[PDB]
Design a protein around this ligand. Structure first.
Ligand SMILES: O=C(O)c1cc(C(=O)O)c2c(n1)C(=O)C(=O)c1cc(C(=O)O)[nH]c1-2
Ligand SMILES: O=C(O)c1cc(C(=O)O)c2c(n1)C(=O)C(=O)c1cc(C(=O)O)[nH]c1-2
Ligand SMILES: [Ca+2]
Ligand SMILES: [Ca+2]
Ligand SMILES: [Ca+2]
Ligand SMILES: [Ca+2]
Ligand SMILES: [Ca+2]
Ligand SMILES: [Ca+2]
Lengths: 444, 452
């Protein structure tokens, strides 16, 4: 898609909705879910707390706090995954993923907790899968259980080939060896959508890569923070691209999603793969022009020059631009990245409507934007095969939307907001003064 | 997708297949189908003939010649639609569409109508009898007629009807109707002028299906709108409707036909990316003596209104699964390696058809869930892979059977180890070096390609 202008975003205030803050003092609220008790359960990434807010009153109780969660003030790590069991009534289990120190600097662990209604807390912990990659960047961590009862988990590319991890060789394309996988060497589990049994083991019907079946379901992802199933069993996803091509992808078994060789469509438009991990002298500066304009010494590969297999394109990109696009926009003062042709999707929620269904939102995908302070409504067709028209921005505000769910009746939306950060105001300029820090707000 | 280079096309020779010309010098062979009698049936667009060929022996027989078929030697009109009834044994019906004089016209060009008609096949007499007009009075012209006709899993006739070439070449100043929809009043008087650049869905008796999508309040024969020249149309085993379509100077498409979907033509070619194309409305040109620069709307003569794809106020837009090809605004549409024929070097392939490879007891390795797209101007058969559910494409369109021929249509034998293709009798094609020729290796031919 084509970038919306600062003007277009500013006029997307969603006047037709009543805004109402439920919670205010929250420490990096990450994910929120509609609990099996008709209560909203959210998480705090830094602290590892699992709250339970009464959606009708706003009363909150700290159910449990995941112990030893590591969190870098400058990072995206901490308590990440968070899901319930499909049949909670009969199987009261909660699934999470978090950043924990690795005695042999950190690892990522997918852990199952056992819910005790009597004491109303989490007990009997079992590690489903550990030794997973960890860094301060692009951890992703969306954890959902599918219609097949499998754990679907997104694990980012750890931020390799950019910023702090500029010269680390991106492994979104890398797959494990039978020998490594046999030694629980999950170093390849970067930029992947994992699919695992409820005991952390490898599903026997998982896709094969290099003659090897592992926990990998799909590959070639950057920072896929959005992951949600549709009423008909399809897997929609939202992902963060580089200076461009944030995506809405349809996850399919064994599908290769191109990162880092391809950002968005394979069109050689506005992005080229500049591999800094192969640069001669590692002193070379990343010009931050999305690979379109690079410093001498860095091997650049056109997406069209990629010799990949099973490449699956996005259903939509926010946004795709041409090579003439200016990645240094003066409108964003110093924070030049906020003026990049992206929206920074923090999640992906599939709106199931209800007896109070918002009119015209049938088969829509809600995608919250961090940097743009909007929540996108992406309409798809009844079969969830394609998108109709564009991504319509909603609830414009000086806030960084982190997640979003809807009530059963489906007339009220609950969104989480970043405790702090940079967001684009009504003009093209930027600010770090967030209107609603670490909050759970409700739109009716 | 990004355009292949002449050299990449050139090496797509396909040595892994045996090339064997069955027939030659057919009169503008258009569509071929695999008959129930395990014999190959093909159509001759100009003459209106229906030929039955013996796959192994090559014996031809003119089974039937559709009477009054109108065809301009220079146009894309004539006998178009050609389909058998799914259960041909119980229901021996052949469905066609063709250009016929319209006694009820009021124009120069626009003197013809397109008619979807049913024929009954007589076993012992071996010819088509008892003709039944199902839907007549359909738009007609020399350009973009499309005319693919398939019978859907729902027992409905699905038909592609091009935008009639409006807004280009000989119809440059005619207002494109791809996005237009019929009023009830028009539907009552059987006025189907708006049936342009559409995928029609109609009952077998030719009436409007009660469960057809609505467009601006009216349920008509329209299933999907906003098409240019959709020559490819084929159902996948799981009921999905795949389609191939010709774009302007760029953005040929592989589309997934979705009920009520707006495929955007002419305001959008390929993705809504505002890249390489722009909608220049020549019918609204200030001074109409102006010329069409043929630079895909990026650069147009003075006086012609131009609307960006992003400025398009349309709804239900469905983007293509793949574009052949998409390029940026800096693209040079005046490519000197094609010289006098500046159109063949454009980032397009002129997809001539769309065939779903169903495999079989001798299926080709790795061809599961593929879509064979014959290219006219590139002399290749693109093999496009999709996932098992036919939801997405895998990788790019791979060129096959490179040759100085205009591939028109393609099918596979039931066992799946041989491909049968039709080539144009005359026309332009890109040579291995990127330049143009009209010297076709196998003019109006029926070629069989057998696998390893
Ligand atoms: O393209 C951008 O301008 C931009 C902005 C932001 C942002 O504002 O937080 C992120 C990203 N990109 C991004 O790629 C990304 O993976 C990301 C993660 C986060 C986050 O807060 O967890 N922000 C962002
Ligand atoms: O862009 C092109 O270079 C190009 C080439 C050709 C061709 O080679 O026939 C056609 C077209 N475009 C085209 O747009 C088109 O609708 C078309 C129809 C036909 C045909 O033979 O029926 N060719 C072509
Ligand atoms: Ca980004
Ligand atoms: Ca991708
Ligand atoms: Ca791209
Ligand atoms: Ca064309
Ligand atoms: Ca289209
Ligand atoms: Ca376009």
């Amino acid at each position: 898609d084509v970038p919306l202008t600062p003007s277009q975003f500013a006029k997307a205030k969603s006047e037709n909705f009543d805004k109402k803050v439920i919670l205010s003092n929250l420490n990096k609220p990450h994910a929120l879910l509609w609990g099996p008790d008709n209560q909203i359960w959210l998480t705090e990434r830094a602290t590892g707390k699992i709250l339970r807010v009464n959606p009708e009153s706003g009363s909150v109780k700290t159910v449990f706090q995941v112990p030893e969660i590591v969190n870098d003030a400058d990072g995206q790590n901490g308590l990440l995954g968070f899901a319930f069991h499909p049949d909670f009534k009969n199987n009261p289990y909660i699934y999470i993923s978090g950043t924990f120190k690795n005695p042999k600097p950190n690892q990522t662990i997918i852990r199952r907790y056992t819910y005790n209604k009597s004491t109303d807390t989490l007990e009997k912990p079992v590690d489903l899968l550990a030794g997973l990659p960890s860094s301060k960047d692009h951890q992703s961590g969306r954890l959902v259980i599918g219609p097949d009862q499998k754990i679907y988990y997104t694990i980012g590319d750890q931020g390799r080939n950019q910023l702090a991890y500029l010269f680390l060789p991106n492994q979104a394309q890398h797959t494990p060896t039978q020998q490594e996988l046999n030694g629980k060497d999950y170093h390849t589990y970067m930029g992947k959508v994992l699919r695992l049994n409820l005991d952390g083991s490898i599903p026997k019907d998982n896709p094969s890569f290099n003659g090897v079946v592992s926990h990998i379901y799909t590959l070639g992802h950057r920072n896929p923070q959005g992951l949600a199933f549709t009423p008909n069993g399809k897997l929609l996803q939202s992902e963060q691209g580089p200076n461009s091509d944030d995506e809405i992808n349809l996850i399919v078994k064994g599908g290769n999603y191109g990162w880092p060789n391809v950002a968005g469509y394979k069109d050689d438009s506005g992005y080229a793969y500049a591999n800094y991990s192969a640069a001669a002298n590692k002193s070379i500066k990343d010009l931050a022009q999305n690979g379109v304009k690079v410093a001498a010494g860095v091997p650049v590969t056109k997406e069209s020059e990629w010799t990949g297999k099973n490449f699956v394109p996005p259903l939509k990109t926010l946004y795709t631009v041409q090579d003439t696009y200016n990645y240094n926009d003066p409108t964003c003062g110093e924070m030049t990245y906020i003026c990049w042709p992206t929206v920074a999707p923090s999640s992906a929620y599939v709106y199931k409507g209800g007896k109070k269904a918002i009119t015209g939102w049938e088969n829509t995908l809600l995608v919250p934007s961090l940097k743009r302070g909007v929540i996108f409504r992406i309409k798809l067709d009844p079969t969830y095969s394609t998108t109709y028209d564009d991504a319509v921005p909603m609830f414009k505000s000086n806030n960084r939307y982190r997640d979003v769910i809807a009530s059963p009746d489906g007339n009220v939306l609950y969104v989480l907001t970043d405790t702090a950060g940079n967001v684009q105001k009504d003009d093209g300029s930027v600010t770090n003064t967030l209107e609603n820090p670490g909050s759970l707000i409700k739109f009716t």
